[PDB]
Subunit: 276 residues, 2 copies
Amino acid sequence: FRLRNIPLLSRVGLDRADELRSNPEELAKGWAEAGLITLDVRGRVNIQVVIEDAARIGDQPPEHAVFLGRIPGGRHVWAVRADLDDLRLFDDTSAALLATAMAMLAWHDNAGYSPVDGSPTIPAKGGWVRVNSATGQEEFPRTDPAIICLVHDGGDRAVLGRQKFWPERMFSLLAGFVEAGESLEACVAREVAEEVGLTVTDVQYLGSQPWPFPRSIMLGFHAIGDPSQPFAFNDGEIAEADWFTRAEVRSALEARLMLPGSISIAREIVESWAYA
Amino acid sequence: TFRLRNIPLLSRVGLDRADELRSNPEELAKGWAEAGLITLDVRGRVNIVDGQVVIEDAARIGDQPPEHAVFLGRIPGGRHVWAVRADLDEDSAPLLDLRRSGQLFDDTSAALLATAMAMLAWHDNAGYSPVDGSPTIPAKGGWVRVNSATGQEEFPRTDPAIICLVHDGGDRAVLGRQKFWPERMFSLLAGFVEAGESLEACVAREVAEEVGLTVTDVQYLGSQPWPFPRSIMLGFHAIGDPSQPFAFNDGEIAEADWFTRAEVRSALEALMLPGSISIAREIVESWAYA
Ligand SMILES: [Ca+2]
Ligand SMILES: [Ca+2]
Ligand SMILES: [Ca+2]
Ligand SMILES: [Ca+2]
Ligand SMILES: [Ca+2]
């Protein structure tokens, strides 16, 4: 099966205007007529995202602002953190602006110092790097790849799992972070084995979604497992799991077994499987 | 469309990482006396014999796992295997690096080395918290570092990068040559995934930035660890329009062109395409002979 829909935060590619990032003159020129999106510390916004006049906060782009690119018509848009008076629905462009702003400002919050030598870092190039104050070495935004997998039997049954300390009825796909030295396919097999003890084959990619909570990209997969093999939960974070039929899943979707919100690529994978 | 013919090098085998032992300091300390040890120099080179990484006796360097060692998992016999950085005697044996000689390694050795290389390089670059600047201390067999001030765990970093073969749906594909590259050296278009974008959006954005094409039907082919120093390469193909002209926007590409399957096959059997462990070569090969 393929995904029926593009995942929600994946929909558009905004015009990021990469070439402007290293052009402080063009950034400073665009500022007077530029738009500004403002996020609080949890990455929440005012709502379509409110775009205010950048010029209101100053006559030049502040250090801690991030240049998001251009909206249709060529207006520059920036993002800043501020005290205000959760993506966790928006138009496509707002969703992309927010995903970018959220990820980038969360990175800044967590990248104030060099991991290499501990020196403070200074934002630069429209907020797309931070520079080691001592050495001049550039640090770059971090996005951790994570897999999320629907294990199925090749027919009408699929594994869903509930993490320890998730609410009782809340089941979903199996997830994990990619480790150093492994392929995505190897990561999927490893993580499924760790979580529910199954050996899976035919690991197949479905799609992807930015997941700035705070810094993931979710990579969706399906894989073939064997229901005659028993579960085993000890090595993982799963409290329980079971094989469910397409009928059960469709039923749970139409609502009791609870599946994650359409925001997650997880829901899109399950939906696309259940109605294939 | 098309699929990869081969699993990329470095993707072939998945190590027994024995994750549960990382958080069991007692079992790690017990296993040490009979444990194996792989040693990498600063450039990530090792000694190999018959395609297989040399495993020395861990006990020779000390009675306990040193702080800077990384626990790689289990080798045959129940034995633990670890990696450390060390100065290697460049004159008393050939030192092979994965990037130049990866083809010579057994699958398991290649994966051990890829993991060790990535993990030791991470340690070298993760001595301090990016959050607050505090020193960090390795723990869990080298699989985290702990903020000395706050106790917050820092985790190994792997940056996703895409690499894309843009084609016309038929018999022609874009290859591009970077400014810093020798004449006739062409390859696929590559870039790092940025915050806030999907892989598909990243592919479209990077192709646009590098050669000015608008591409659709972004399709995943495969993946390969790429510890030089800390990537994972994610291979894709996409449909471009040859009637749209190139534009070398971001300044990274000096030239690019559409090449036929015949040209590419020809260049592979020797536009220069050298031999390579990169997924890039596997993508081009798989396309050219589809
Ligand atoms: Ca551009
Ligand atoms: Ca585990
Ligand atoms: Ca051998
Ligand atoms: Ca020496
Ligand atoms: Ca690039």
